[PDB]
């Protein structure tokens, strides 16, 4: 990247994309004991977006890095949360 702003953005956004994909794949998996609502990903993804977007107000490129870095952190959390939930439903029901 050599400090090129846009190249940094591309790198983080690729990680974000991987996280989003892993989360949609979990949710999609078909057993209705998990009970994920229809628009669950899209409503959570959006909520994460609006939260992280406040970081633009911090100013300039730095704001974007923090914003993109927040989206990544929130999605990584969402993903772990969902995995954990799936594991708990699995070992609790019969």
């Amino acid at each position: 990247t050599s400090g090129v702003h846009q190249k940094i953005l591309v790198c983080i956004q690729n990680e974000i994309a991987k996280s989003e994909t892993q989360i949609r794949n979990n949710i999609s998996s078909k057993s209705i004991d998990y009970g994920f609502p229809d628009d669950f990903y899209s409503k959570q993804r959006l909520a994460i977006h609006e939260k992280c977007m406040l970081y633009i107000n911090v100013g300039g490129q730095r704001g974007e890095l923090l914003m993109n870095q927040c989206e990544l952190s929130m999605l990584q959390g969402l993903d772990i949360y969902i995995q954990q939930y799936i594991e708990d439903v699995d070992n609790s029901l019969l």
Binding site: S2, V4, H5, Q6, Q13, A17, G59, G60, R62, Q69
Partner: protein, 197 residues
Amino acid sequence: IWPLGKTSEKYESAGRGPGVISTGNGDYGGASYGCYQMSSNLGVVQKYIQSSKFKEFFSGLNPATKEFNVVWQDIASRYPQEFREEQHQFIKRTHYDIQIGHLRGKGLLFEHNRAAVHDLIWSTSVQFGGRTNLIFNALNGQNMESMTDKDIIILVQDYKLVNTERLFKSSPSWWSDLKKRAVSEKKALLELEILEH
């Protein structure tokens, strides 16, 4: 004759023409446009189009769409100099001018100096925002002469470099490059200040 912002162009425009469009990865990646890659996801390219002499070329079209993109590159190829110049002016208004205006109100004046100090102002305003306090803080408690362009440059570039970790907590993975950048720009700006006179 020194293009304003030239010292940091390799971090901002990185030699892109005004027709450069990149598609973003992720649900909210959108599209980024021009020399400085105005992001549609951030609302920036939309704001620029609102103000552009080319506004009506884009009537009824929206960013990150095939049709918008055809118009954008048509304008880049028919008006490469006009388009490029107006894009640069949009960044100047949204960053440089704002930082110049705020420093004027905090008491700091640069009317004007060598291109080097103004390239410092530009660079710093694009990287940290038109309302950043980083310059005003780098210079805190300092008589505004006995202050050469060289002192100013050394001061804010040293400030940027030691505050890299505080300013970028969330991103410790990009520290190495962010420090290399502040050091690299310090050297470029000092060379430019000398070539200035």
